[PDB]
Design a protein around this ligand. Structure first.
Ligand SMILES: Cc1ncsc1-c1ccc([C@H](C)NC(=O)[C@@H]2C[C@@H](O)CN2C(=O)[C@@H](c2cc(O[C@@H](C)CN3CC[C@@H](N4CCN5c6cc(-c7ccccc7O)nnc6NC[C@H]5C4)C3)no2)C(C)C)cc1
Ligand SMILES: Cc1ncsc1-c1ccc([C@H](C)NC(=O)[C@@H]2C[C@@H](O)CN2C(=O)[C@@H](c2cc(O[C@@H](C)CN3CC[C@@H](N4CCN5c6cc(-c7ccccc7O)nnc6NC[C@H]5C4)C3)no2)C(C)C)cc1
Ligand SMILES: Cc1ncsc1-c1ccc([C@H](C)NC(=O)[C@@H]2C[C@@H](O)CN2C(=O)[C@@H](c2cc(O[C@@H](C)CN3CC[C@@H](N4CCN5c6cc(-c7ccccc7O)nnc6NC[C@H]5C4)C3)no2)C(C)C)cc1
Lengths: 109, 148, 87, 104, 89, 150, 151, 89, 149, 92, 103, 96
């Protein structure tokens, strides 16, 4: 399970689009409140892609449905905060679509 | 498709207005909505703080006529090399004689009087179709979907 | 080569072929070194040529382009001529 | 500014926004994107008047104060059948029940 | 985009993100993604207005200037309240 | 008392600007964090009011007790004025949930004794009966403020 | 430089709200106290902007350079932010003198080269030609600050 | 409390004393004190609007709320500017 | 090797725009970092020139070898083209010191063998004789980069 | 705040302090180290030269760090040599 | 955008002002420096008196003839009692004849 | 000498102007432009403890360098006052 959680989470991070650019590069580590205070006031549950591997190294996630619940939470946290049609908005739309195809390949094949 | 990219990496730029017109710098925001910025008088230049990947566009503040920057329609500052500033050279394009005439007529005659000119009906419509950032953005998109 | 544009009042304008072709309507008519414009006076067709000179010279010029001037007195008739020519 | 629209043909209703400054043509392109029919097979009407592809939504009459997000302005749609275009036909939405005496 | 279909059978094409404002729609779409969702007990004059809210909420959330009242006519109020309750919002 | 005014003794001139359609009830939290009703602002009105630095305020629809917003937030605390320039409290409608907004309208049209006549679920009937309330909302804001972030 | 921003390094979130019928030019005074034009606010909009504590701002009709007000005064300096709550800058028309207001309208109807053609007194023509100006107004505001700091 | 301003054509305008005093020239002409003042070179369509300004200025000076634009039609603009300067409004 | 072009292999389109009143000598530093003279730009002219990225350039008065500026600095290195956009090198006069400027004018009026006839200090005579020079200036620019490092 | 430069033939030139400081020699002379000196006297610089030295201060101050285009600072042959002398002495 | 030398007798003031600024505003700048009030100063462009109410622009001073390197000269005269002091701008030292080296 | 050097440097820092504000309060990732235009950067007490300054004329040489490197970079008056308050603070401690 931890290996599959590492595979699912590492496939979403390593995933490059059809111009060669990695999408997760912004979603790797959150900004300091000092840097961007508006995001923290807007967002209830600040979570990034390291905070999720940290959980996975601690195996904080119980099932593959608990790992998904908090990848949808940050990808939806991004959408709420950002402008519709922004660079960061449509990649959290793709990172939800690449996580939902990555969990569907590892968990049942 | 045509939008700035949130970058975090500053790119100092020099807006140089080498048109005879007052220039309206237009920054495309992250959603890709035109944002008017402070105007450059003719023959002036300013250093401005912008970011890498930010997309800009320039126009005649008065008429909203199309201008050019470094012989093209969009300007996107590259990453600065060794701190030296990138340069945005803003100039007239070579307008069609027609479009240029429209410009002059439009500037002399009140829009409600376009109807009094002894010209063809098509020309009235052309006169009334004032140039516009959004119309031009739509065109520029189809010109980039045609290069793909 | 060169090409001859003839105004309503009957002035002759000899301009380079490539200069003239900047006009889609002339391009069409030459597709022959003569074209006659019964509805375009000289003070207009003269300036239409001056534009060909301008367009040909300054298209693809990097440093700086100067505004193509049009006096109020000629503006309307030029706009008419411009649209007819497709220049 | 922003204009909020319902583009409706028959029992289809598309909810979308555009700019006052954007054009009737790009709106046809949005429809193309959804209903898979090009702008030359589409007619867009504001009420009963046909809208020219070249005019800005603003010039057509869609102001920010008549195309609000909660009161979207209705653009009518017609598709081309061969030589002719179908009639503009917008099947009405379901009627609400007579106002209950409790609310009077 | 996503397709919401009323009881009488009107089709409403609205941006996916706009629709997701409804927790109940989020559930129906996120749980097997499809494009259509069918509401057998919501009429058009109601589901039309439910969309208009999505438009409103999406647009005016995080708005600095001032926000305008989301209007509801008496004639539609009860059925909308029902629909609103059934949908998260 | 987490959510309370602070005895400053430094005056802070403020402008209450009602940019909501609703009659606004300004509510000053006391030092014991107790809501204190103040005179109502008519819709589209603005008044200069004398308050003190650190004093905590809250605004609501004087009629329905519905929640409003000041400067995009639920609570307003005047900063210390710079150069006598007055601070500005911009009071606006929030984006109500469609449900809560519907409740508002139904509540405004139907007498409370007739909520029973509406062909709706009992849970919805309870929601109709459950009028919005400053104290309930203050309790919620404390737990959300005792969480260092939101 | 009496009127100037103060380098602080403490950020202050602000909301520029344009409640004038005009396009508004926000003007940030830099540390030396030189006016710096910023992006315009269309009438009836509000934007969250990042500024710092002690930074001094000023607002104007982007077109005419006519004087505006912010929180019923001429200068806006963001207060220290408390609890993340953004400060609010409410930008509005002042009550222009009937004269200044008339000038505004005449100026808006007649091309500047034609002010000369109006059958009015030369003094009025001079007033018409004296376009409003941030710098002239800044000079006046300084003398108005040394006049309540004289006494 | 009220004062009478009389236009060239001979219209009478009864306005509060304090409203009128917004004009230095009027303040001077009134500063016992009289009830009438006559403007032989100011027509009614102008002096009417000059009063409307007094109403406006008195009301909206010191208002925390947004102030609305004092409108002036092109047809009146020049004569108003003349009148304005004479009055010191 | 300190101040040198880099073998990028990636072409960069550039526009040399001469907004100085002088005839401009574009000077490309090669990979070894040796100045390479290129064709002169007449005053008020602009040309599109094929180049490569990371390449390091430098501009001077073709006649006097006086120092010029490009984008308000001394060295120009083209960025990789973004979406085909040509990068722009704006060449201008710097604000010369009053002294250096005077030297320029005197040097332009008096034959070098007559510098000896001017009733000036010997140090000034040496300064006049010293003519500006790409190599001397390159040496200075390196010490200014080892002083930043 | 301004400064007074006085030529050999005794012309007075009032120029902004910051404009003058463009000269190292002047900066040195201005900067008893309790308070500032307004006058400085040039025994060996005539007016037609010191006048032009000021014109340079005007030029330098204005066009330093100006982005699009700077114009060449003109010097007539008649003044060139004496200006070069003055220039070197001043360090401007 | 206009560069000026305001000269009275052996005194020369080097200063800028806007084309749009007025002859009066210039007198005020002089007041600020020489501590002499605006109404006793008389400013000339060449040999013509400038009205306090005219803009430097309308007097004839333009950016293209009042450049920082070639400042335009405004003549200055003071007032002693009733009389006007004569426009007297005592010329600068003269340059030596062009050296034979430069011909 | 260290007691005298501390009295002079602490007086310049603690010095408030006639509105009550402390001037010294202001005193590469953040601002690379200072780290391109100013030659010899500093932020002074460190070199009073390490005894790098041999006289009260060597402490002054680098307070003038810091005040002058401020004037160079920005198109300022407090570094003009901090030079005037250092030149009166050294003149009171070193000879009284
Ligand atoms: C005088 C004159 N004359 C003629 S023109 C002119 C003139 C011109 C300009 C100006 C003014 C001074 N300048 C401008 O207007 C310039 C111009 C144009 O270039 C845009 N711009 C701007 O100012 C925009 C602007 C500024 C900015 O700065 C970012 C780097 C700061 N951002 C926070 C730090 C990073 N962000 C960090 C979190 N990151 C996010 C992360 C996540 C996330 C990640 C992981 C997991 C979950 C998550 O949610 N989510 N969201 C994020 N969003 C931010 C992103 C990056 C960048 N950027 O743009 C301003 C105006 C909008 C004056 C005069
Ligand atoms: C027209 C219109 N429209 C829409 S709204 C409106 C409107 C708005 C406002 C007003 C009017 C003019 N303004 C107001 O009402 C303003 C507004 C709001 O900001 C509060 N406020 C008030 O007036 C309160 C107020 C507070 C206060 O501050 C002290 C200096 C006043 N007093 C001296 C001394 C203190 N006490 C302080 C504890 N202190 C003790 C403390 C302790 C203690 C503390 C900590 C720990 C241990 C301890 O033991 N112990 N004992 C104490 N005993 C003494 C006590 C003294 C109070 N000034 O005014 C008023 C209402 C309370 C009008 C219209
Ligand atoms: C979209 C839209 N629509 C309508 S309006 C708008 C909009 C809104 C916002 C923006 C953008 C994002 N925001 C802005 O433009 C905001 C606004 C306005 O408030 C200024 N500003 C800025 O960004 C300035 C700015 C940034 C800054 O942050 C400091 C950390 C910068 N520092 C202090 C000034 C330097 N100093 C640094 C010490 N330094 C010295 C240090 C020392 C010293 C210190 C310690 C020890 C020893 C020492 O010697 N000594 N001397 C010094 N001298 C120089 C001094 C300089 C850096 N502060 O201001 C920007 C524009 C300048 C865009 C659009």
């Amino acid at each position: 399970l931890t290996k599959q959680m590492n595979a699912i989470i590492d496939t979403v991070i390593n995933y490059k689009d059809s111009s060669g650019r990695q999408l997760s590069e912004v979603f790797i580590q959150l900004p300091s409140r000092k840097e961007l205070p508006e995001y923290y006031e807007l967002i209830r549950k600040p979570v990034d892609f390291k905070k999720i591997k940290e959980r996975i190294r601690n195996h904080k996630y119980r099932s593959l449905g608990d790992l998904e619940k908090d990848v949808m939470l940050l990808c939806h946290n991004a959408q709420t905060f950002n402008l519709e049609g922004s660079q960061i908005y449509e990649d959290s739309i793709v990172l939800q679509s690449v996580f939902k195809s990555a969990r569907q390949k590892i968990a049942k094949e | 498709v045509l939008r700035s990219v949130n970058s975090r990496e500053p790119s100092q730029v020099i807006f140089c207005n080498r048109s005879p017109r007052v220039v309206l710098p237009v920054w495309l925001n992250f959603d890709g909505e035109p944002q008017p910025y402070p105007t450059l008088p003719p023959g002036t230049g300013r250093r401005i703080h912008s970011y890498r990947g930010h997309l800009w566009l320039f126009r005649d503040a008065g008429t909203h006529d199309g201008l050019l920057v470094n012989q093209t329609e969009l300007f996107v500052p590259s990453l600065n090399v060794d701190g030296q500033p990138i340069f945005a050279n803003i100039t007239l394009p070579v307008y069609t004689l027609k479009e240029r005439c429209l410009q002059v007529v439009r500037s002399l005659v009140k829009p409600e009087n376009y109807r009094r000119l002894d010209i063809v009906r098509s020309l009235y419509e052309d006169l009334e179709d004032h140039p516009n950032v959004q119309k031009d953005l739509e065109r520029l998109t189809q010109e980039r979907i045609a290069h793909q | 080569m060169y090409v001859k544009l003839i105004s309503s009042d009957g002035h002759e304008f000899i301009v380079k072929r490539e200069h003239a072709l900047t006009s889609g309507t002339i391009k069409a008519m030459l597709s022959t070194n003569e074209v006659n414009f019964r509805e375009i006076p000289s003070h207009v067709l003269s300036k239409v040529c001056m534009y060909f000179t301008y367009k040909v010279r300054y298209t693809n010029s990097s440093t700086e382009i100067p505004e193509f001037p049009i006096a109020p007195e000629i503006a309307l008739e030029l706009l008419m001529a411009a649209n007819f020519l497709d220049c | 500014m922003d204009v909020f629209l319902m583009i409706r043909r028959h029992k289809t209703t598309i909810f979308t926004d555009a700019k006052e400054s954007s054009t009737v043509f790009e709106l046809k392109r949005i429809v193309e994107g959804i209903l898979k029919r090009p702008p030359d097979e589409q007619r867009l009407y504001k009420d009963d008047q046909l809208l020219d592809d070249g005019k800005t939504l603003g010039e057509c009459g869609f102001t920010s104060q008549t195309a609000r997000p909660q009161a979207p302005a209705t653009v009518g749609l017609a598709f081309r059948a061969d030589d002719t275009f179908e009639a503009l036909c917008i099947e009405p939405f379901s009627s609400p029940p007579e106002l209950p005496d409790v609310m009077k």
